[PDB]
């Protein structure tokens, strides 16, 4: 069934699963035309496919060219996502294919389900969680490779950097969703928080800064503050 707070530890067990988020697959800027009408120009997108246990991010870049000459792009995008996820599963050895794929938006269920009819044993599941994966394009190095791509391309990132060396998956995921929730609620503040101290660098092979355990608690506390705050500022409390 659907994935919610009650069955949250199932993510870190030893059944392979992937979250698929499609919120950044079809991205546009909206602008005025010379005739004073409105028009969209698509920009590069990405599928966020994530193993929550390992941190493996299979980042499929959706080059604007895939949209050329197509109608009903918001609908196509769901199918395109499903086709790309399906191709991914088929490319992985059997022992690495997911037992479950969990979609962050219910509109992806049917597209994925139809694309995966060949895999009756892979459960396609929604979730009730309001997960912040849309904020993945506020991670500078992910946005960079999406915006630079000149063709379709798959890029691999470990979204937890080296954290699993020191913490559990349950804690790595909880940090990731706190970071991304913060970035989604106020990107400037969130980023300021992460970078204020120039002595803490992001290794070339990482996405996030090399905080010590203690620095991560401070950071994590500051992100919680930010999220409470922005919530007040939003609801005046």
């Amino acid at each position: 069934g659907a994935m919610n707070s009650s069955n949250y530890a199932e993510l870190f067990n030893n059944d392979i699963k992937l979250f698929v988020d499609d919120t950044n697959v079809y991205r546009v800027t909206v602008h005025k035309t010379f005739e004073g009408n409105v028009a969209t120009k698509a920009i590069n997108g990405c599928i966020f496919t994530l193993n929550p246990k390992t941190g493996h991010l299979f980042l499929k870049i959706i080059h604007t060219s895939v949209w050329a000459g197509q109608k009903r792009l918001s609908q196509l995008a769901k199918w395109k996502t499903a086709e790309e996820v399906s191709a991914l599963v088929r490319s992985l050895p059997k022992e690495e294919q997911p037992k479950q794929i969990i979609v962050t938006r219910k509109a992806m269920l049917d597209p994925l389900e139809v694309h995966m009819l060949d895999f009756p044993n892979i459960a396609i599941r929604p979730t009730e969680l309001r997960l912040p994966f849309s904020a993945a394009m506020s991670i500078d190095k992910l946005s960079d490779v999406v915006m630079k791509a000149t063709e379709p391309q798959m890029v691999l990132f470990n979204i937890y950097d080296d954290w699993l060396d020191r913490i559990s998956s349950y804690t790595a995921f909880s940090r990731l969703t706190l970071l991304l929730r913060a970035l989604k609620t106020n990107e400037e503040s969130a980023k300021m928080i992460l970078l204020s101290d120039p002595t803490i660098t992001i290794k070339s092979y990482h996405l996030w800064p090399s905080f010590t355990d203690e620095q991560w608690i401070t950071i994590e506390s500051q992100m919680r503050d930010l999220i409470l705050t922005e919530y007040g500022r939003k609801y005046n409390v």
């Binding site: 199918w79 086709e83 049917d110 597209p111 139809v114 694309h115």
Partner: protein
């Protein structure tokens, strides 16, 4: 005009013949039904006065033999049987007609309802859906499940309707996933019409049979099948024009005939609103949409 004689009516029962029905009291001197129109399939059905649970009945065609009804006090139901001795059958019927112990199938002459509800229904096809090859007539009741219901437990007593499943490899061509899911014309025209049903008449006959089993027995898996077969057409962008016109007529009379009080359980709000207002064929069911909106606007 043909006759279904009853040996007797030992238990109080409501007897349906096609869309008609009448009350028989316990040990009332009833000996059957006469003047049944030749040329159509028919259904005779039963709901006991005591146990309104289990509507049941028999699909038959009087051209395929001489049939009578006899109560079975061990199995507790009105059973249909064939009389092979044709002289014995004529003699029995004539005696009962002379003594006027029979109800007259009460067709009004202007009335084409039954024809319009059974236009494509053919006994031979019924017998493939209800497998009991030693009899020329077919038994259906409220509780029989369909082949596809069993796939989601007694196979001999099932309704072997054609399985329709919109999220199946049969329905979806590899590489046309989105195309085939959003426009089911491939599945209608190639898989089902050309491949399985052969023509639109056999397709329409299953659909009318499913509808009739749903209405007369409240057979749930029958209603599911009727709705699926409507949806598959309504969700195909490419449908022969003659099929849409006949579909509109078929459904029109189904909807006309449905009891007003049973609409809440026999009609699937989602399928109907989709078919009438969202689907490719939303503008192609003019008679069906007009009766639906004047008779069941609540559903819409």
């Amino acid at each position: 005009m043909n006759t279904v004689p009853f040996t007797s009516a030992p238990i109080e029962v409501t007897i349906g013949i096609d869309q008609y029905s009448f009350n028989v009291k316990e040990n009332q001197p009833f000996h059957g039904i006469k003047d049944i129109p030749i040329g159509h399939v028919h259904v005779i059905h039963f709901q006991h006065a005591d146990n309104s649970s289990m509507r049941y009945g028999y699909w038959f065609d009087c051209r395929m033999g001489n049939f009578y009804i006899q109560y079975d006090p061990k199995d507790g139901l009105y059973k249909m049987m064939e009389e092979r001795d044709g002289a014995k059958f004529e003699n029995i019927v004539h005696n009962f007609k002379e003594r006027q112990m029979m109800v007259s199938y009460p067709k009004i002459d202007e009335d084409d309802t039954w024809y319009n509800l059974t236009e494509f229904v053919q006994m031979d096809k019924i017998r493939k859906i209800v497998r009991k090859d030693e009899n020329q007539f077919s038994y259906v009741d409220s509780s029989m499940t369909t082949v596809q219901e069993n796939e989601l437990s007694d196979p001999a007593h099932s309704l072997n309707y054609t399985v329709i499943n919109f999220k199946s490899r049969e329905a979806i061509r590899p590489g046309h996933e989105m195309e085939d899911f959003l426009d089911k014309s491939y599945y209608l025209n190639t898989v089902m019409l050309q491949g399985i049903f052969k023509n639109s008449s056999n397709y329409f006959g299953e659909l009318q049979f499913a509808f009739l089993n749903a209405m007369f027995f409240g057979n749930y898996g029958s209603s599911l099948q009727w709705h699926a077969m409507i949806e598959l057409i309504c969700s195909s962008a490419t449908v022969p024009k003659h099929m849409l016109d006949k579909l509109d007529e078929i459904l029109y009379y189904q909807i006309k005939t449905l009891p007003e009080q049973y609409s809440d359980i026999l009609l699937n709000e989602r399928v109907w609103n989709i078919c009438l207002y969202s689907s490719f064929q939303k503008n192609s069911l003019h008679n069906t949409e007009k009766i639906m909106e004047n008779k069941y606007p609540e559903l819409l």
